[PDB]
Chain A
Amino acid sequence: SHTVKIYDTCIGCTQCVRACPTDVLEMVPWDGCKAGQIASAPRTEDCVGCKRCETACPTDFLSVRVYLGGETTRSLGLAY
């Protein structure tokens, strides 16, 4: 399964979570930004690696980073 990391540059704009096609990211409470929220990656087993999450990231060099790793039938997007 791929690896998804969140960095404290998160501004809690939720654009990553609402762009994930496989429900990998979610918004959790935080105290490091104005919005009081930070993205989390608790379901990386469903991560497919499409990187839509970091295409919607407005922070300078990203706050969500997807590191491709071992492959799985879920991560390979295999309907068969």
Chain B
Amino acid sequence: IQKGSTVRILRKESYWYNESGTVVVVDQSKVRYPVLVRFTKVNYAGTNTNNFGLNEVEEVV
């Protein structure tokens, strides 16, 4: 995955679970949740972006 890639959220406790988002940036450092994904639908708190782990996102073909 990279910037601009489309991924499916696999985190169950997510307002965008099973949904598709756009990767903003994948951090190359040793952070726990490097993948930053932007969504079109705001969550219940109003935010439309979140940091996800490498195993919590699945790239769409």
Contact = CB atoms under 8 A, between A and B. Distances in A.
A34 B51 CA distance: 11
A58 B48 CA distance: 10
Contact of A33 (B15, B31, B47): B31
B interface: dominant SS: loop
A58 B47 contact: yes
B27 A60 contact: no
A59 B50 contact: yes
B18 interface: no
A32 B32 CA distance: 6
Nearest to B29: A34
B32 A33 contact: yes
Interface residues of A, number: 11
Interface in A2-37: 8-9, 11, 31-34
B50 A8 contact: no
Interface in A47-62: 58-61
B14 A9 contact: no
Contacts of B14: 60-61
B32 to A, nearest CB: 5
Given A9-B33, A60-B15, A34 B27 contact: yes
